[PDB]
Amino acid sequence: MNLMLALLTNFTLATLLVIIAFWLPQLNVYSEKTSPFSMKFFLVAITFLLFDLEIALLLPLPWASQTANLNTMLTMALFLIILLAVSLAYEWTQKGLEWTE
Amino acid sequence: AKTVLRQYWDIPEGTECHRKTYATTSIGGAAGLVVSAYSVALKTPTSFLEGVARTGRYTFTAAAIGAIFGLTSCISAQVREKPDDPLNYLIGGCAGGLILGARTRSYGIGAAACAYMGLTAALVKMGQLEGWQVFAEPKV
Amino acid sequence: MMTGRQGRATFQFLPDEARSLPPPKLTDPRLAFVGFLGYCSGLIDNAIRRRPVLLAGLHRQLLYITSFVFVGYYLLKRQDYMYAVRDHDMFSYIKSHPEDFPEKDKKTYGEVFEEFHPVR
Amino acid sequence: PGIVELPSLEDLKVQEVKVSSSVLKAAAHHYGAQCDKPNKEFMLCRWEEKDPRRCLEEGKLVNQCALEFFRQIKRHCAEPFTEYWTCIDYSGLQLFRRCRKQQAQFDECVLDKLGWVRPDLGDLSKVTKVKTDRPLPENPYHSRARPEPNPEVEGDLKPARHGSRLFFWTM
Amino acid sequence: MNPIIFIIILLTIMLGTIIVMISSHWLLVWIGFEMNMLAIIPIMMKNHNPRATEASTKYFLTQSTASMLLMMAVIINLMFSGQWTVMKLFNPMASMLMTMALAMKLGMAPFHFWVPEVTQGIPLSSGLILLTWQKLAPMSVLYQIFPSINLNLILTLSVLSILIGGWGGLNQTQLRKIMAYSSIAHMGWMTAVLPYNPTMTLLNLIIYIIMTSTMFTMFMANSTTTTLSLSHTWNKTPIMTVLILATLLSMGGLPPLSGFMPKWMIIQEMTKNNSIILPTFMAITALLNLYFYMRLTYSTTLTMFPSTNNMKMKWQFPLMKKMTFLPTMVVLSTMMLPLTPMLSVLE
Amino acid sequence: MSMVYMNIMMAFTVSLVGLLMYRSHLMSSLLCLEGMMLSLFVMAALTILNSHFTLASMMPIILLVFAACEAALGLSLLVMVSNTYGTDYVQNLNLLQC
Amino acid sequence: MMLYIVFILSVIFVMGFVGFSSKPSPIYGGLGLIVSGGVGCGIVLNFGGSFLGLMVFLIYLGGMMVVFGYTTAMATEQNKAVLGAFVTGLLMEFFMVYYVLKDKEVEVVFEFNGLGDWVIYDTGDSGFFSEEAMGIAALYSYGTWLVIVTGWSLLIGVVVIMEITRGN
Amino acid sequence: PFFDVQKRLGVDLDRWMTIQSAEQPHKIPSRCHAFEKEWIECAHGIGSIRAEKECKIEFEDFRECLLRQKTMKRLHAIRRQREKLIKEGKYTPPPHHS
Ligand SMILES: CCCCCCCCCCCCCCCCCC(=O)OC[C@H](COP(=O)(O)OCCN)OC(=O)CCCCCCCCCCCCCCCCC
Ligand SMILES: CCCCCCCCCCCCCCCCCC(=O)OC[C@H](COP(=O)(O)OCCN)OC(=O)CCCCCCCCCCCCCCCCC
């Protein structure tokens, strides 16, 4: 219940400031004023997604070090990170990480 | 489709023709909607009003065929006092076949439909007598 | 149907028990036909590449025949094993259930009544 | 199916040990080195019977030893112990390492007054053996007899009778 | 595309299909399918033109939807049985979605509208993978869950495939569409005998792969993709027309060619189960396949169609295409009937 | 089953029907495809957590990783469709009728 | 009304699905899928899954959904059908909620119950660890095969997407 | 499997997560470990044709521990009966139930 109140208070407070911000100066009456897809940007987002997913597989590492099979665990932990570095090398050499046309 | 067929086959042949006709009319009416369901999906009607006109047209033609099959095939089994006779279904199938020709405005379709629908109907009656199976249950 | 057979070693081309069966003879009619197929593949190889059909690449034609006979020998060895297993299971099951497979009572034709339909 | 049998409300009654988790956690190490025998009999009962209704009498014995264990502290070492679990109770995580100074006094007091030796690191986590007269259950899972296996195929693998017998093939 | 990357992508298509066949867990089966779809799209986009882009899109949407339905069946099966093992499903609703998910992947009617269009928009080599290799993974799962498949559903999908493959093929002049409808028709046979004898499902699959691979290989040699362009072959490579005639006759089931063996054995395993109406209707409807196969035999080998003047410049060069295993595949497609009893090696 | 399963199971149905009825945009359908995996993710996690199927606690993460990799491949095709016809309308992808 | 928090969240879960399933403009469709994701995590958290629930925020909402919105703003060129579908969806949700709250038993394909989700929770736990966390950490000790195939697929995703997007 | 490579090579690729009564880290049991064990040991070796008939008693118990369908029907009946008697003055909850 505590975490629920904390979220309710923060967003309720933010909404109040926003609406009274759009209305408090409107208590004033000012005269009415009257009167390309980029490919490289997309590749940054996709590269982040595939890297972000691989991070999801690495988050449980601290708990994985508590096992009695450290030899197996340490072998796969270094395999995931090595594979993550192989993806970076492939993009680097294939001109993926460039911003020049 | 499982429950409606049981209703048709539960009624002994050549009796209670009012209920048999209702069963046949339901099956044909359903088959009409199934056909018109795909027709509207794959061939888009020009407008909503045009769509319901097509769906009603197929549904009635399908329901008209089934309606006259059960009525004609049930009256025949009465006057002849012969329930277990495929010739009763042959008359019903051809009678339904003519209706299909009537709705399409073609004498050729009516003659071809009568011959083939009548032939198919007779086989259906034969299978029920002798326990033929279209979807056989594996046994060996 | 013969997948979960009780006497079975999964994912084996020729289990151990197949060695107690006679090998296919090197003069097996089926094995000669398989070899003949290899020779036909050799001639077609020449034809599609516009080479003399009968003479070109005798060394190539020799390996078409040998490879077919080599592969054919082992497939035949497994073919005869799978049919031996089927009979082995069929007979064992019959012993285990004698009531389902009784010895037919035999009556001579002098006593069994068969209707006669004249052709006139 | 059947009717679930449950013990009566008077078969479960026993004198509870009403002391907070800080009191238990302060006396945990001495408690486990003194009441091991009644404790392990009850646990052997639970992991074998797999049914709490079968180990109620062993459960009451566990309670009685704990009550008798705390009375001895109540007689000889009361102020040292009351001052030990008051420091444990202060921390949100109830840490031992924040109260080494108070632990020594309580540890020394029991040593002189009762000859209690605190178990060393790794002792209370050891698998032990317990001599019990309770018979070993035969069918703890209440399982039925397994269906009998199929007859096994045995004999000599002879070649197929006349070959494949597929239509017209002769071998 | 770099040659090394082409090998890597192909091995990933194979690895996806192999994972499906060696897995005793529904999660690894699903992973196998996902790895397979991910790797095959780049070989469909390799020519970089709008039609390839459209074909790859229609394939992704179809296979993505099919995989979601499959994963829904696995979870429902987990709720009602508490296990993941690759075997009979324990809920009728799980079986329907699983059976329908695989039907969409295979391309069976009425989940068939993508096979003619995807096969048309991709090169011949990509179509060969799509119509032969991509059918191994779904058939492997069907081989294992068939004891719980709804009989009326699997036999209803089989009958529609045979009909729709037949009628669809009559109105085609493009070669890639003709094989696509031919592929739908042969799928119905494989799934029709599945409830009765799964061994004959594999035999029909093996024979179909051999015959289909032979046709695509011969089309790729002459770079022919239309009926008319195939009719110039007699004036360029006369031998290749005789091989096309023999294979087309085989695919139609005409004895004594190999393509009669599966149709022969499937009819046997269905009459043993007192199924007489279905095999007859299946066999008669297959004459539609024999018709548009025969039409290609009239415009390719049995008649000499008009040629063009520039054809004379082709006579001065040889065939530099690989034509891998073509001599071996063509013989297996025509001359295997005397070895029919060898199907026991598949048991 | 239970009361929560009904809404999760009905949320998958909504997304499936949403995916099978395209309006104009291709991006709209990909969202309905990623809604389907969200419902499957929650439904599986509810089953695994409630039954204390410990080793299956990693399955929902694997479901998320592959489903997102598939989603990335879907967006790439959408981009290449938009670079050709100027928009992500599905009606443009109709060359293969003939 | 706090004992039925899971069911209340599930009702909001469905309403969001009816939001983007009706397919408003992609900008609003993605907005509705973020709300469902957040509610989806809320349900998973209340069943004991904390790592799994938070993984939804970090990877699904803060990951994929950001790429979806990022790609929408750059490749989307910023009706009766939408309103018709949206109203149809809410009505079915209302009737399903109405009946399961009236007789507490509904049969649509499956037999659903209406007592409350709390009635199936386990009644005993005294572990010094999180059972969910232990299972996920087993990915490295038990799931050797899973790690290899998952990693290879992610690596192939990088190769494949660059091939598709080159355009030449 | 279609191909039993795991059994041929004796390598456990994916059989460790197939059932919830297998070895779990720290020996954490599933809620229905006993029921799954009983059904598995009943149906072992006799094929699934026989197990569907000769191990039906164990299977129904396993499915009762998974979805708890029968129990919720029983609790639902008791709640209705108590509610019916509650709004007639005919019942009195004891102090420790309130
Ligand atoms: C019994 C009285 C009726 C018979 C009267 C006969 C007199 C003449 C009038 C003809 C009427 C024919 C209608 C017969 C159908 C009813 C009889 C029948 O056979 O039942 C079929 C089905 C029953 O529906 P059901 O609720 O499931 O009943 C369960 C009973 N066991 O009912 C049907 O719906 C069958 C019709 C096909 C339904 C599916 C059509 C496709 C639905 C999808 C629509 C398109 C997708 C939706 C989104 C599009 C955008 C809006
Ligand atoms: C045993 C228990 C009894 C079971 C119930 C028995 C009753 C069965 C009812 C039969 C149902 C038939 C289904 C077909 C319905 C009609 C389909 C339709 O609506 O379209 C017909 C079509 C119209 O085309 P058109 O109008 O020219 O084009 C318009 C373009 N805007 O015009 C055509 O082209 C007609 C072509 C139709 C051919 C389809 C095959 C005929 C049906 C096969 C079944 C034969 C057996 C039926 C006899 C009873 C069997 C027991």
Q: How far is CA E228 from CA B117, E172, E211, E318, G106, in A?
A: 40, 12, 22, 22, 62
* Residue G168 included in any domain: no
Domain that holds residue G70: 4-162
Distance B62 CA to ligand 2 centre (A): 5
CB A74 within 8 A of CB G142: no
Q: What is the CA radius of gyration of chain E?
A: 20
Alpha-carbon gap, residue B15 to E73, rounded angstroms = 46
Read off the tokens for F92: 């443009």
Following DSSP, what letter does each residue of E69-119 receive, concatenated? HHHHHHHHHHHHHSB-BSS--S-HHHHHHHHHHHHHHHT-TTS-THHHHHH
Alpha-carbon gap, residue G148 to E341, rounded angstroms = 42
Alpha-carbon gap, residue C90 to C82, rounded angstroms = 12
Alpha-carbon gap, residue F57 to G52, rounded angstroms = 8
H9 touches chain G (CB under 8 A): no
One-letter amino acid of G19: G
Helix, strand, coil percent values for chain F (each to nearest 5): 85, 0, 15
Alpha-carbon gap, residue G33 to G41, rounded angstroms = 12
Which residue has 């070989």 as its token pair?
Answer: E43
CB D160 within 8 A of CB C83: yes
Domain that holds residue F25: 3-85
* Residue G167 included in any domain: no
Helices (H) and strands (E) in chain G, counts: 7, 2
Alpha-carbon gap, residue E250 to E331, rounded angstroms = 11
D155 contacts: CB under 8 Å, gap ≥ 6: C88, C92
Strand partners, E226: E174
Q: What is the CA radius of gyration of chain G?
A: 21
Residue nearest to atom 27 of ligand 2 (CA): B104
Substitution site in B6, B20, B24, B33 for ligand 1 pocket (most atoms within 8 Å of beta carbon): B33
Alpha-carbon gap, residue E93 to E97, rounded angstroms = 7
Report phi then psi at F89, rounded to 5.
Answer: -80, 135
Distance B32 CA to ligand 1 centre (A): 10
G105-108 vs G110-113, strand pairing mode: antiparallel
- Chain A, 35 to 94: residues with Cβ < 8 Å from chain G are 37-39, 41-43, 45-50, 52-54, 56-57, 59-61, 63-64, 66-67, 69, 72-73, 76-77, 79-80, 83, 86-87, 90-91, 94
Read off the tokens for E12: 């990933």
Report phi then psi at E195, rounded to 5.
Answer: -60, -25
CA distance H38 to chain C (A): 22
One-letter amino acid of E114: W
Resolution of the coordinates in A? 2.6
Question: Nearest Cα to F1, choosing from F47, F60, F63, F34?
Answer: F47
Q: How was this structure determined?
A: cryo-EM
Alpha-carbon gap, residue E256 to E248, rounded angstroms = 13
For chain A, list the domains and their CATH numbers. 7-93 (1.20.58.1610)
Alpha-carbon gap, residue D22 to D25, rounded angstroms = 5
Q: Is the torsion defined by CA of D163, D166, D169, D170 positive or negative?
A: positive
What are chain G's partners, defined as 3 or more CB pairs within 8 angstroms? A, E, F, H
One-letter amino acid of F95: L
Alpha-carbon gap, residue H87 to H98, rounded angstroms = 16
- DSSP 8-state symbol, H15: S
- Cβ separation F14–G139 shorter than 8 A: no
Which residue has 């149905």 as its token pair?
Answer: F13
Read off the tokens for D163: 């070959």
Instruction: Name the 3-class secondary structure at A59.
Output: coil
CA distance H54 to chain D (A): 7
* Residue G38 included in any domain: yes
Q: How far is CA G33 from CA F11, G12, G66, G68, in A?
A: 12, 12, 11, 11
Question: Could you write out the three-class secondary structure of G73-116?
Answer: HHHCCCCHHHHHHHHHHHHHHHHHHHHHCCCCEEEECEEEECCC
Which residue has 């493009």 as its token pair?
Answer: E174
| Chain H interface disruption, residue of F46, F47, F53, most H CBs within 10 A | F53
Following DSSP, what letter does each residue of H41-91 receive, concatenated? HHHTTSHHHHHHHHTHHHHHHHHHHHH-HHHHHHHHHHHHHHHHHHTTT--
CA trace torsion E141, E143, E149, E151 (10° rounding): 140
Question: Angle CA(H46)–CA(B140)–CA(E261) in degrees, nearest 5?
Answer: 120
B117 contacts: CB under 8 Å, gap ≥ 6: B93, B94, B96, B97, B100
Alpha-carbon gap, residue E201 to E140, rounded angstroms = 10
Which atom of ligand 1 lies nearest, measured to the CA of F17? 48
Q: What is the CA radius of gyration of chain B?
A: 17
Which residues in chain A have Cβ-Cβ distances shorter than 8 Å to G74? 37-38, 41-42
Report phi then psi at D91, rounded to 5.
Answer: -85, 140
CB burial class (10 A; 0-12, 13-18, 19+) of residue A82?
Answer: exposed
> Which member of E1, E35, E48 has the closest CB to residue G149?
E35
Q: Is B47 left (phi over 0), alpha (psi -120 to 50) or beta?
A: beta
Alpha-carbon gap, residue H81 to H83, rounded angstroms = 5
Alpha-carbon gap, residue E91 to H95, rounded angstroms = 45
Residue nearest to atom 12 of ligand 2 (CA): B62
* Residue F97 included in any domain: no
Q: How far is CA E300 from CA C44, E219, E235, E307, F98, in A?
A: 19, 12, 10, 12, 23
Alpha-carbon gap, residue A69 to H25, rounded angstroms = 11
> Which member of D141, D143, D147 has the closest CB to residue H46?
D147
Alpha-carbon gap, residue E237 to E221, rounded angstroms = 10
Report phi then psi at H38, rounded to 5.
Answer: -65, -45
Report phi then psi at G111, rounded to 5.
Answer: -90, 105
F37 touches chain E (CB under 8 A): yes
* Residue F23 included in any domain: yes
Alpha-carbon gap, residue H5 to E140, rounded angstroms = 14
> Which member of F68, F82, F83 has the closest CB to residue A49?
F68
Instruction: Give how many domains chain F has, as a whole number.
Output: 1
What are chain A's partners, defined as 3 or more CB pairs within 8 angstroms? F, G
Instruction: Name the 3-class secondary structure at D131.
Output: coil
One-letter amino acid of E226: T
H2 contacts: CB under 8 Å, gap ≥ 6: E20, E21, E22, E140, E143, E144
Cis peptide before E110 (omega within 30 of 0): yes
Alpha-carbon gap, residue H56 to H42, rounded angstroms = 9
Alpha-carbon gap, residue G135 to G142, rounded angstroms = 9
CB E224 within 8 A of CB E175: yes
* Residue G123 included in any domain: yes
Give the CB-side neighbour count of residue F11, counting CA atoms within 13 A.
Answer: 31
Give the CB-side neighbour count of residue F56, counting CA atoms within 13 A.
Answer: 30
Alpha-carbon gap, residue E141 to E103, rounded angstroms = 11
Alpha-carbon gap, residue E30 to E36, rounded angstroms = 10
B74 contacts: CB under 8 Å, gap ≥ 6: B13, B14, B15, B17, B20, B21, B92
Which residue has 């399903």 as its token pair?
Answer: G96
Cis peptide before E256 (omega within 30 of 0): yes
Report phi then psi at E142, rounded to 5.
Answer: -60, -35
Alpha-carbon gap, residue G150 to E163, rounded angstroms = 41
Alpha-carbon gap, residue G81 to G79, rounded angstroms = 5
CB D23 within 8 A of CB D83: no
Question: Could you write out the three-class secondary structure of E155-209?
Answer: HHHHHHHHHHHHHHHHCCCEHHHHHHHHHHHHHHHHHHCCCCCHHHHHHHHHHHH
- Touching status, chains A and G (3+ beta-carbon pairs under 8 Å): yes
> Which secondary-structure segment (H or E) carries D87?
helix D79-88
Give the CATH number, domain containing residue F66: 1.10.287.3510
Burial state string for B18-46 with b = 16 or more CB within 10 A and e = fewer than 16: eebbbbbbbbbbbbbeeebeebbeeeeee
Residue nearest to atom 31 of ligand 1 (CA): B3
Which residue has 């009564």 as its token pair?
Answer: H21
Enumerate chain E positions whose Cβ falls within 8 A of a Cβ in H.
Answer: 20-25, 27-28, 79-88, 140, 143-144, 147
CB burial class (10 A; 0-12, 13-18, 19+) of residue G163?
Answer: buried
Alpha-carbon gap, residue E239 to E323, rounded angstroms = 14
C17 touches chain D (CB under 8 A): yes
CB burial class (10 A; 0-12, 13-18, 19+) of residue E269?
Answer: buried
D46 contacts: CB under 8 Å, gap ≥ 6: D52, D55
- DSSP 8-state symbol, G64: I
CB H32 within 8 A of CB H65: yes
CB burial class (10 A; 0-12, 13-18, 19+) of residue C34?
Answer: buried
* Residue F98 included in any domain: no
Report phi then psi at G113, rounded to 5.
Answer: -115, 160
Which residues in chain E have Cβ-Cβ distances shorter than 8 Å to C3? 347
Q: What is the CA radius of gyration of chain F?
A: 17
Which atom of ligand 2 lies nearest, measured to the CA of B66? 7
Q: How far is CA C45 from CA C41, C62, E241, H59, in A?
A: 6, 12, 15, 61
- DSSP 8-state symbol, E309: G
What are chain B's partners, defined as 3 or more CB pairs within 8 angstroms? E
Alpha-carbon gap, residue E176 to E125, rounded angstroms = 11
Read off the tokens for A45: 């987002």
Alpha-carbon gap, residue G137 to G141, rounded angstroms = 8
> Which member of G146, G152, G168 has the closest CB to residue E48?
G168
Read off the tokens for B7: 């209703």
- Cβ separation D157–C18 shorter than 8 A: yes
Burial state string for H32-51 with b = 16 or more CB within 10 A and e = fewer than 16: bbbbbbbbbebbeebeeeeb
* Residue F72 included in any domain: yes
E230 contacts: CB under 8 Å, gap ≥ 6: E175, E219, E222, E224, E244, E296, E299, E300
Read off the tokens for E242: 């005789």
Question: Could you write out the three-class secondary structure of chain C?
Answer: CCCCCCCCCCCCCCCHHHHHCCCCCCCCHHHHHHHHHHHHHHHHHHHHCCCCCCCCCHHHHHHHHHHHHHHHHHHHHHHHHHHHHHHHHHHHHHHHCHHHCCCCCCCCCCCCCCCCCCCC
E195 contacts: CB under 8 Å, gap ≥ 6: B138, E146, E149, E151, E154, E155
Give the CATH number, domain containing residue G52: 1.20.120.1200
One-letter amino acid of B6: R
- Chain C, 57 to 116: residues with Cβ < 8 Å from chain E are 64, 75-76, 78-79, 82-83, 86
Instruction: Give how many domains chain G has, as a whole number.
Output: 1
Alpha-carbon gap, residue E93 to E109, rounded angstroms = 20
D142 contacts: CB under 8 Å, gap ≥ 6: none
Q: How far is CA E101 from CA D150, E20, E31, F12, G77, in A?
A: 36, 15, 15, 15, 34
Rounded to the nearest 10 degrees, what angle do helices A70-93 and A39-56 cross at? 180
> Could you report how far apart the first and last alpha carbons of chain C are, in Å?
50
- Cβ separation E275–B132 shorter than 8 A: no
Following DSSP, what letter does each residue of E218-235 receive, concatenated? HHHHHT--BHHHHTTGGG
Alpha-carbon gap, residue D86 to D82, rounded angstroms = 6
- What residues flank ligand 2, with Cβ below 6 Å? B 8, 24, 27-28, 31-32, 35, 54, 58, 61-62, 65-66, 69, 93, 96, 100, 104, 117, 120-121, 124
Alpha-carbon gap, residue B82 to E96, rounded angstroms = 43
> Which secondary-structure segment (H or E) carries H40?
helix H33-43
Alpha-carbon gap, residue D69 to D73, rounded angstroms = 7
